[PDB]
Design an enzyme around this catalytic site. Structure first.
Site, PDB file in Angstrom:
ATOM      1  N   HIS A  61       0.977  -0.795  -0.046  1.00 14.49           N
ATOM      2  CA  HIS A  61       0.102  -0.130   0.359  1.00 14.49           C
ATOM      3  C   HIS A  61       1.181   1.303   0.001  1.00 14.49           C
ATOM      4  O   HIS A  61       0.472   3.021  -0.790  1.00 14.49           O
ATOM      5  CB  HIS A  61      -1.168   0.439   1.222  1.00 14.49           C
ATOM      6  CG  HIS A  61      -2.206  -1.111   1.238  1.00 14.49           C
ATOM      7  ND1 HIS A  61      -2.224  -2.054   2.720  1.00 14.49           N
ATOM      8  CD2 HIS A  61      -2.860  -1.470   0.932  1.00 14.49           C
ATOM      9  CE1 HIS A  61      -2.719  -3.049   2.222  1.00 14.49           C
ATOM     10  NE2 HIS A  61      -3.517  -2.904   0.989  1.00 14.49           N
ATOM     11  N   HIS A  91       5.725   6.624   6.337  1.00 10.90           N
ATOM     12  CA  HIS A  91       5.490   6.609   5.023  1.00 10.90           C
ATOM     13  C   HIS A  91       4.759   8.051   4.415  1.00 10.90           C
ATOM     14  O   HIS A  91       4.379   8.524   4.952  1.00 10.90           O
ATOM     15  CB  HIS A  91       4.376   5.481   5.066  1.00 10.90           C
ATOM     16  CG  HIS A  91       3.350   5.606   5.485  1.00 10.90           C
ATOM     17  ND1 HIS A  91       3.131   6.057   7.338  1.00 10.90           N
ATOM     18  CD2 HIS A  91       2.276   6.896   5.440  1.00 10.90           C
ATOM     19  CE1 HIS A  91       1.681   6.211   7.633  1.00 10.90           C
ATOM     20  NE2 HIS A  91       1.186   6.289   6.640  1.00 10.90           N
ATOM     21  N   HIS A  93       1.666   9.546   0.655  1.00 13.48           N
ATOM     22  CA  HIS A  93       1.311   8.581  -0.368  1.00 13.48           C
ATOM     23  C   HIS A  93       1.810  10.182  -0.979  1.00 13.48           C
ATOM     24  O   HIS A  93       2.091  11.146  -0.976  1.00 13.48           O
ATOM     25  CB  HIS A  93      -0.054   9.571   0.567  1.00 13.48           C
ATOM     26  CG  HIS A  93      -0.607   8.135   1.602  1.00 13.48           C
ATOM     27  ND1 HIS A  93      -1.049   7.614   1.927  1.00 13.48           N
ATOM     28  CD2 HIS A  93       0.408   8.641   2.883  1.00 13.48           C
ATOM     29  CE1 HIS A  93      -1.212   6.831   2.983  1.00 13.48           C
ATOM     30  NE2 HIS A  93      -1.009   7.775   3.983  1.00 13.48           N
ATOM     31  N   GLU A 103      -2.903  13.390   1.252  1.00 13.75           N
ATOM     32  CA  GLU A 103      -4.503  13.095   1.398  1.00 13.75           C
ATOM     33  C   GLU A 103      -5.064  14.467   1.704  1.00 13.75           C
ATOM     34  O   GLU A 103      -6.300  14.414   1.704  1.00 13.75           O
ATOM     35  CB  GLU A 103      -4.224  11.621   2.365  1.00 13.75           C
ATOM     36  CG  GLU A 103      -3.679  11.183   2.069  1.00 13.75           C
ATOM     37  CD  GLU A 103      -4.257   9.049   2.705  1.00 13.75           C
ATOM     38  OE1 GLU A 103      -3.542   9.651   4.521  1.00 13.75           O
ATOM     39  OE2 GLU A 103      -4.713   8.102   2.226  1.00 13.75           O
ATOM     40  N   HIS A 116       3.862  11.184   5.899  1.00 14.98           N
ATOM     41  CA  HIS A 116       2.711  10.495   7.613  1.00 14.98           C
ATOM     42  C   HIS A 116       4.456  10.010   8.168  1.00 14.98           C
ATOM     43  O   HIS A 116       4.634   9.374   8.401  1.00 14.98           O
ATOM     44  CB  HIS A 116       2.057   9.842   7.356  1.00 14.98           C
ATOM     45  CG  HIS A 116       0.778  10.611   6.799  1.00 14.98           C
ATOM     46  ND1 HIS A 116      -0.632   9.721   5.896  1.00 14.98           N
ATOM     47  CD2 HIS A 116       0.357  11.869   6.575  1.00 14.98           C
ATOM     48  CE1 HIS A 116      -0.850  10.865   5.526  1.00 14.98           C
ATOM     49  NE2 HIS A 116      -0.741  11.671   6.046  1.00 14.98           N
ATOM     50  N   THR A 195      -6.204   7.036   7.693  1.00 17.67           N
ATOM     51  CA  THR A 195      -6.648   7.359   6.028  1.00 17.67           C
ATOM     52  C   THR A 195      -6.845   6.361   5.782  1.00 17.67           C
ATOM     53  O   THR A 195      -6.545   5.900   4.749  1.00 17.67           O
ATOM     54  CB  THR A 195      -5.842   8.159   5.945  1.00 17.67           C
ATOM     55  OG1 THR A 195      -4.405   7.746   5.269  1.00 17.67           O
ATOM     56  CG2 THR A 195      -5.572   9.353   6.460  1.00 17.67           C
TER      57      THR A 195
HETATM   58  N1  5UM Z   1      -2.245   6.658   6.809  1.00 11.79           N
HETATM   59  S1  5UM Z   1      -1.981   6.373   8.101  1.00 11.79           S
HETATM   60  O1  5UM Z   1      -3.168   6.749   8.360  1.00 11.79           O
HETATM   61  O2  5UM Z   1      -0.873   7.445   8.682  1.00 11.79           O
HETATM   62  C1  5UM Z   1      -1.847   5.197   8.826  1.00 11.79           C
HETATM   63  C2  5UM Z   1      -2.846   4.048   8.189  1.00 11.79           C
HETATM   64  C3  5UM Z   1      -2.668   2.630   8.798  1.00 11.79           C
HETATM   65  C4  5UM Z   1      -1.389   2.895  10.071  1.00 11.79           C
HETATM   66  N2  5UM Z   1      -1.366   1.590  10.578  1.00 11.79           N
HETATM   67  C5  5UM Z   1      -2.069   0.004  10.405  1.00 11.79           C
HETATM   68  O3  5UM Z   1      -2.674   0.409   9.855  1.00 11.79           O
HETATM   69  C6  5UM Z   1      -1.565  -1.225  10.609  1.00 11.79           C
HETATM   70  C7  5UM Z   1      -2.982  -1.871  11.644  1.00 11.79           C
HETATM   71  C8  5UM Z   1      -3.575  -3.051  11.451  1.00 11.79           C
HETATM   72  C9  5UM Z   1      -4.013  -2.652  12.579  1.00 11.79           C
HETATM   73  C10 5UM Z   1      -4.773  -2.481  13.609  1.00 11.79           C
HETATM   74  S2  5UM Z   1      -3.680  -1.207  13.085  1.00 11.79           S
HETATM   75  C11 5UM Z   1      -0.745   3.595  10.390  1.00 11.79           C
HETATM   76  F1  5UM Z   1       0.213   3.231  11.402  1.00 11.79           F
HETATM   77  C12 5UM Z   1      -0.840   5.426   9.994  1.00 11.79           C
HETATM   78 ZN    ZN Z   2      -0.240   7.983   5.510  1.00  9.10          ZN
END
Ligand code: 5UM
Ligand code: ZN
Length: 257
Positions: A61, A91, A93, A103, A116, A195
Site C-alpha cells: 500500500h 511513510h 502517499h 491526502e 506521515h 486514512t
Molecule cells: N495513513 S496513516 O493514517 O498515517 C496510517 C494508516 C495505517 C496505519 N497502520 C495500520 O493500519 C496497521 C494496523 C492494522 C490493524 C490495526 S492498525 C498507520 F500506522 C498509519
Molecule cells: Zn498515511
C-alpha cells in the site's frame, strides 16, 4: 482485499470497514479561513536526535521506514498533545501526477505527496493497544511539493529499487528523520482517523503549514514502486491516497495567526 483501484478503492472500504462513514474520519480538507487560531496551543516538541531506524518495507500500500520504539528514542510531545508519543514509522502517499497525491488538502489544493510520521501514546504500552484508543496515535503530516530536491530524502529514494514489490524489506539503519522536516513547525490540528483500513478513529492529526520541496526525480522514483508482489502482474504504486472526508462535528485549530 482493499486497495486503491476501481474495484477495491476508497469508495468500497465501508463494506468491510463501516467506520469509513464515521464521525471522525481522515483525511479532511483544511479550510484555512475557517480554521481557528488557538493561542492556548503549545509549540510542537519534536525530539528525534536519538532516533533508531531499522528497516524499510513495501507493504503493498506504501513503504514504511520503521523505527525502534521500545524506548523513548524519538518522540513527539507538546502541541495539542498530553503525554509522550513514540515514533514507530513514517511513510508517504503520492500521486501519478504532480497535481495530486496528498491526502489532506488545503483550501481544496492537492499537493504531490504527503509524509506521515506515525507516533503512539506511551501510556498504552504498545502500538496495537494504542490504535484502540481515541488519543492513541499522533500523526505528523507534511506536504510535499515538486521543486528543489530534499537532500534528507535522498537516502530513502535510493533504497527503493531494493523493495520494489509487496513484501520486500531492506535494512535501513541510521536514517535521520529530522532531514524531512520543513523550517517552520506551525501546524493545524484536529481529531481524526487512520486514512487506510482499518480506519480506526485513534489519531490526533498534526499537519504542518509549510510543505517541503522534493525534486521531480525524487517523486518519479516513488512512482516506480509496485503494489503487487514479485512475479505478479505489475501495477505501479501510485495514487495511494484517500480523498478528503466530511468534517462533520469537528473544528480544525491553528497554532498560528
Ligand atoms: N495513513 S496513516 O493514517 O498515517 C496510517 C494508516 C495505517 C496505519 N497502520 C495500520 O493500519 C496497521 C494496523 C492494522 C490493524 C490495526 S492498525 C498507520 F500506522 C498509519
Ligand atoms: Zn498515511
Amino acid at each position: 482485499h482493499w486497495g486503491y483501484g476501481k474495484h477495491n478503492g476508497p469508495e468500497h472500504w465501508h463494506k468491510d470497514f463501516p467506520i469509513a462513514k464515521g464521525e471522525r474520519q481522515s483525511p479532511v480538507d483544511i479550510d484555512t479561513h475557517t480554521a481557528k487560531y488557538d493561542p492556548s496551543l503549545k509549540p510542537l516538541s519534536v525530539s528525534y536526535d536519538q532516533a533508531t531506524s531499522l528497516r524499510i518495507l513495501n507493504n503493498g500500500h506504501a513503504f514504511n521506514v520503521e523505527f525502534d520504539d521500545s524506548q523513548d528514542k524519538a518522540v513527539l510531545k507538546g502541541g495539542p498533545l498530553d503525554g509522550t508519543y513514540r515514533l514507530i514509522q513514517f511513510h508517504f502517499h503520492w500521486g501519478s501526477l504532480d497535481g495530486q497525491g496528498s491526502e489532506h488538502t488545503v483550501d481544496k489544493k492537492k499537493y504531490a505527496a504527503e509524509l506521515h510520521l506515525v507516533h503512539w501514546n506511551t501510556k498504552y504500552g504498545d502500538f496495537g493497544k494504542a490504535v484502540q484508543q481515541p488519543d492513541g496515535l499522533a500523526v505528523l503530516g507534511i506536504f510535499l511539493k515538486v521543486g528543489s530536491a530534499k537532500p534528507g530524502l535522498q537516502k530513502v529514494v535510493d533504497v527503493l529499487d531494493s523493495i520494489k514489490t509487496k513484501g520486500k524489506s531492506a535494512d535501513f539503519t541510521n536514517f535521520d528523520p529530522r532531514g524531512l522536516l520543513p523550517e517552520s513547525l506551525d501546524y493545524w490540528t484536529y481529531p481524526g482517523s487512520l486514512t487506510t483500513p482499518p480506519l480506526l478513529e485513534c489519531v490526533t492529526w498534526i499537519v504542518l503549514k509549510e510543505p517541503i520541496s522534493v525534486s521531480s526525480e525524487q517523486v518519479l522514483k516513488f512512482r516506480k514502486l509496485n503494489f503487487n508482489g514479485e512475479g505478479e502482474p505489475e501495477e505501479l504504486m501510485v495514487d495511494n491516497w484517500r480523498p478528503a472526508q466530511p468534517l462533520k462535528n469537528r473544528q480544525i485549530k491553528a497554532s498560528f495567526k
